Structures are given as C-alpha cells and as structure tokens.
Assembly symmetry: C2
C-alpha cells in the first residue's frame, strides 16, 4: 500500500543470555508475530543485519532457514543489509520500499547478536579487526570516536565534562527502565574516574555490550486491517526513512575534519520532507549514543539546538537536573528514556532497535515511570554506523 505502519514488535530480554544468535533471532520473530496477530505464513519478506558474535554467510537466509520460515506462501524476498548501527532503520526503510513498490505487503526486520556472552577478548579482536586500515590504536572504534571528540573540543569549544555528562543523563533514564543494564545512576565524578579507554573517552562513556534480538513487522495500512486487526502510537505509521553516509574512519591528521564529514542532519533533513513534518513537532527522540560525542553531534543534526551547541544542550539538562533532584524529567529532555547504548545496552548492530521500541512505548503510553507528558504524537529515531560512517533516520507518528 501507500501508508505503511510498524504493525508488530517482538524482542528478547537484554543482558547475558547464553543463547546463540539464531536462537535469539527466532524468539524475537515469534514474539513479533504474536504482537502483530500474524502467523509466519502471513509474511512475505525479511531483512536482517549481520551479527558480530556469530558472523554468517547470507545471515537473513540462514536465520530464515533455521527459524523454519520456509516453505512460504508464495514468493518470499530475503535480504541482508550491512550499514553497521544504522542497519535496523536502513532495513526498516527497505521494508517500506517493499510495501510501496508492492514486492511484498508485510516485511519483517530482524537484528540479533550476543556480544556480551562472546567475551571481552573475542569482542575486542572481532570489533577491532573490522576497522583495518584506519590507523586507529586499540580499541579502534573508541579511539576512532575519541578522535572526533578531541577535534570537537578545539573547533566548537565543547568541554570535556560535557562528554562525561552524556552517560550521566542516560543513567538517570536507565534506572526507571527495569530491563536496562544500568540500574544505578552514575555521578559526573564516577564517570571521570572510570578506567580510561581512549584519551578523552572513559569506560563508563562506552556503549554497554549486551546480548539481545529485536524483530519488527512492517505492513501496509490497508492490507493489515482486513486480516489481523491507540493503535496509532502502538502500531505507528512509518512516515519516512532516509539515509546518508561518510568515511569508515577519520582522517589521520586529527584535523582536516569538516562539518560535512558528519552525516546525520541530511538523513534527518530528508525524513522530515517525506513526512511533511519538522523538528519542533517531534517530542520523543531515539538517538544513537555509542559514545558521548555520538549523542552530542546528534542533537545538533535533527534540530534540537544549533550547530556547535550540543555540549550546551546536555549541560542545561544536567544543570536542570542537579537543581531539581537530580530528577531527570523526560519532558525537558525527551531523549533516550531507555538509557541508550550507554545504559540500556548495545548488541553491536541491534541497539538502534531500542530507540524504535522506546518510541512506540512513549507513543503507545507504555513508558511507565519514563512517560513523556504530554504524550508525543510523533517520534524521531536514529541509527549511526561505523565511526560516523552511516546515518539513517526514520519518522514514526501515531496519526496521519
């Protein structure tokens, strides 16, 4: 059809589950079909993303085979896409494509990994290998992000302490979510005295490795109601999805870096246009946050504050918090009320899915102690890949 909604959501718990990637992927898919009032047979496509713990040739085909989705009710398109942490939204965009071009009317999007159970040595070897030719000291991704952090300090006047604040705010958010890995909030000093991983990035500022899988069912507005029917927020309209890209790793000069290297605003800029919406009208933001500089660059890009003022955005919330509890009220910082990759958890390419599930929870008034009030009608979700290498942004709204 033309209007396409997220019609089902299924996920496993997050943490150390001691289960294989195929085991996790299958469970998330069985939950999502139950949540959508569907059977396997009612699905006509699947897009999935690669797993770091269990790398696999034709992963979506491998997952779809092992989960027993075959034989199928006719044609059945299967695809695997790799854009790193931007993946789940990229695939959500393709899912809309398949429904719009009528190659399939319902699409499942799956992300699954087990990078916590894999062990610190294995995760390090595999994640660091992925960045060959970067010239990045180990750990490569944190040092890769570490470099952009350091470059930001000198061009825009960002403060080191503004970095360390990013995990403070996410921790405040995490403790109202029972499933989040971080259940005890951090202090700004706790973060700074944490074991140094890269020069301006400490341990508590790194994404929180976790196992987990999430599945989404995507369907056409018209198609779904006649066979399986606020199912606005609860089964939101995907208004738009858009992408943009950049280098897989930063330049080796520490400078020569330029504002167009960062790729998030153009993805966001495009998603608004397809949706006929804009930023002041978005009141829940799910923003990728693998390291402090990643979340900082993001709030600029979707349009919550001007370029360069991203460190300032966090502090006013951190200050607004300190002289108020410190209770971080969602409604003044309606951003990553789940804790993000910092404090909810980060299964490699999976965790952008958690921005989507938290968008639906806020939109469906299912956010508990974390509920944004008044309830937002529209949400923005963001996934980022590599080291600012892939950006894809979606717009989810309850009502048209």
């Amino acid at each position: 059809s033309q209007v396409v909604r997220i019609v089902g959501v299924g996920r496993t718990g997050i943490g150390k589950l001691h289960k294989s990637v195929d085991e996790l992927a299958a469970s998330a898919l069985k939950c999502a079909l139950v949540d959508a009032n569907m059977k396997q047979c009612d699905l006509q496509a699947l897009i999935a993303v690669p797993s770091l713990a269990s790398p696999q040739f034709m992963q979506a085909h491998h997952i779809a085979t092992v989960a027993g989705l075959f034989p199928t009710k006719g044609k059945f398109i299967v695809r695997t896409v790799d854009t790193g942490g931007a993946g789940p939204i990229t695939a959500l965009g393709m899912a809309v494509d398949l429904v719009r071009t009528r190659c399939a009317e319902t699409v499942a999007v799956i992300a699954a990994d087990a990078v916590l159970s894999m062990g610190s040595g294995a995760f390090a070897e595999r994640s660091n290998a992925s960045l060959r030719r970067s010239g990045l000291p180990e750990p490569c991704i944190p040092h890769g992000y570490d470099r952009y952090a350091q470059w930001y300090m000198s061009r825009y006047g960002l403060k080191r302490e503004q970095l360390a604040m990013v995990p403070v705010l996410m921790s405040k958010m995490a403790e109202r979510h029972p499933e989040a890995m971080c259940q005890k909030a951090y202090t700004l000093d706790e973060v700074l005295h944490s074991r140094c991983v890269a020069p301006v990035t400490n341990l508590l500022e790194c994404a929180r490795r976790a196992d987990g899988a999430v599945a989404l069912i995507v369907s056409g507005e018209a198609h779904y109601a006649e066979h399986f029917a606020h199912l606005g927020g609860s089964k939101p309209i995907i208004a738009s999805v858009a992408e943009a890209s950049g280098p897989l790793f930063p330049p080796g000069s520490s400078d020569d870096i330029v504002p167009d290297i960062f790729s998030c605003r153009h993805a966001a800029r495009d998603a608004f246009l397809s949706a006929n919406l804009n930023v002041g009208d978005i009141h829940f933001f799910g923003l990728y946050d693998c390291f402090p500089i990643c979340l900082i660059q993001a709030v600029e890009a979707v349009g919550l504050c001007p370029e360069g003022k991203g460190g300032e955005f966090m502090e006013t919330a951190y200050n607004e918090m300190l002289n108020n509890g410190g209770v971080l009220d969602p409604s003044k910082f309606p951003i990553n009320t789940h804790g993000g990759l910092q404090c909810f958890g980060a299964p490699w390419e999976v965790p952008a899915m958690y921005n989507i599930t938290e968008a639906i929870a806020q939109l469906s008034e299912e956010a508990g102690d974390r509920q944004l009030t008044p309830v937002p009608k529209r949400a923005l979700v963001y996934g980022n890949g590599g080291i600012f290498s892939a950006s894809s942004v979606a717009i989810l709204i309850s009502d048209l």
Copy 2:
C-alpha cells in the same frame, strides 16, 4: 531519471591477479567512471557485496574510504547487500530504486573478490563454514546442489550425462572469449571422466575459481543526457529487476524437496510483468550456472523449456553441436556466450556481473566471435546465491 540506464561499466581482468580486493574494486570503479565520462564527484551512492577473501564489516564503506571517495560533495549513500551470488543483480535494483526517489542521481555498484589468490585451503574452509548447521558433507556447496540434481534425476528423470553436458557447452562458449579461464572445449566424455566430487558432480562441473571485480554506474537517462552527453546497447536501459528466495541449504531428505522451493520462476515472472515483456522479447540469457543443475533449473524457470526437461534441453543442444562440427552455434543456444561460471570464471559473489557485461556486449554488437546476429535488443540476466536460496532477475533493453 524515469528511464534508467547502466551508464558505465568497468571490470578488471579475471584469473590469479596478485591484487587486493580493494585494488580490484577501486580499479574497476575508476574504469566504470572513465567509461561514463564521470569523476568520483559525480557519484551519489555506492552499493557493494561482501568478499570471501577479504571479509569486511560494512564492506562498501571500507571500499569508498580506502579508495578515497571521501570527503564527498553532495549526498553519497552507501549500503552493503548480501544475497550471495545474486548480489550484483539485487544491488542493481536498489540502485534503480535509489534513482527513482531522488535519493541519489548516479549510483556505483561494486563487486570484487579474490578466491583464487586466496588459496585452495582457505576457499574450502570459508565456503564450508557458510553452510554451517546444514549437515551437508564437505565440500558443502557442491554437495547441496548435487542433492537437488538427484532430485531432478529422480523427480524428472534427468540423466548424469545431461548434467555433464553443461560444462561442455560452457567450454565451447568460453573458447571464443579471450578472457575466459577455460580456453579449450571439453568433450562430454571428459567431463564424465572428471574427478567425482559429489554423487552427480565432477570436478569439471564446478565453477572456476578466479579473482576479479566489476563496477556499474547507474543513472537516469535524461540526467546523463542533461549533464554528461552506440548510445543504446552500450549503455542499456534497465527494463526491470525482481527477486525471490529460498532456504540457504536443503532439508537433507530429497523427499522434502519440492518444485515450490525454486524462486527463479517467481523472480522471472515479476521481471517480465514489470517490463511488460515476456520470454519472446529476449534473445540473450546470462544465466547463473554454478553447477549444471542451476543452469538446467534456470532455463526451465525462465521458460526456455518445460519444467523438468532442462537436461533434455542440454542434450538436444549438445547433440546439434556435434551435428555441426562439433561447432556450437550461438543462435541455437543463446546462453552464457562468455562461458559462465563453469569456464569463464567465478569470483564468489561477483560473476553475475559477467552475465550483465556479456549482455551489454551482445546488445551492443560487440561480442566479437560470440556476437549474436541479428543484434539482440533485449537480454535477461539471472543471479543465484547460496543453494537456490536467492534469485535475482534483470531485463536490459537497448532503446524504448
């Protein structure tokens, strides 16, 4: 940008090339760009497929980074897709989609691998790994198709020598191609005397490991004419693209195998229906042929002979060859005039690219000693990944 063409084509040599996968991709992309009278700056997207020799997280981003596609001028979306050997055709559709929604005005599609320079030991392990949990005896990939072959032999009455006839015919096409790995034709008796690999699979019935890369530039017709202007066949219109899929490996019973598994039929009908053409408008077929059972299944699925009679299709074509030389006349067998994966060469996920490049040569009356006369106006190309797991079909036309 309504009529969409392959605006550039570049490829490296094939063989044992003593080159990295990134050198090949970069060399082919610069060739494809020279071919279009374009520079790096004119690209607005990049799509690639994974490499077995140099497996890489976010493979396409890695290529564009190392090859220096960054920093970029205006919008440059990058994605990696894995549908196995179906990838280049899967990717061609994404490229066309990207052109229609104006998410990018010019697209590079890149496939590069080096499974020959990588060594025979490594090729066996990594390819065997791909079918983990299948239960297929090693080597796994040959053993899997082999199973469908006996199912063909036992369901449709297919015979051993009719399978073995495929590489004879492919050797004949290959000997007229200056680049093909195989430079001297086989006898049907030598293929049958070839080293037994699986029950119905001999050494000469297997794809010929090779290094190589091919790049395509896809753009809108007017756009190419309005910004960069045989300008038909040499830069053909992509008339249609479609896909369908199946299991990554067989159930392992031969009695669980059913005609409804195969997806080439589903892919072909949609490519036909979407182009508003049918088999009669096509006079060249580039058909993925990793093993005889694939080419046999393909010609039936596309409609060159009834279901089950694909081995008979080969026998009647091989017989006529003998009754002319034995000279294989193209017009009696307008299929894989370059030699295919059997005898031209097969760099893992790349060789569907060779079906397209041989289609362009045929369409442009530049196929030399293999040239079909009268010049074909339309071709159908087909790629396969895994074990009848992915089907991708395209249709290219010279002028509308």
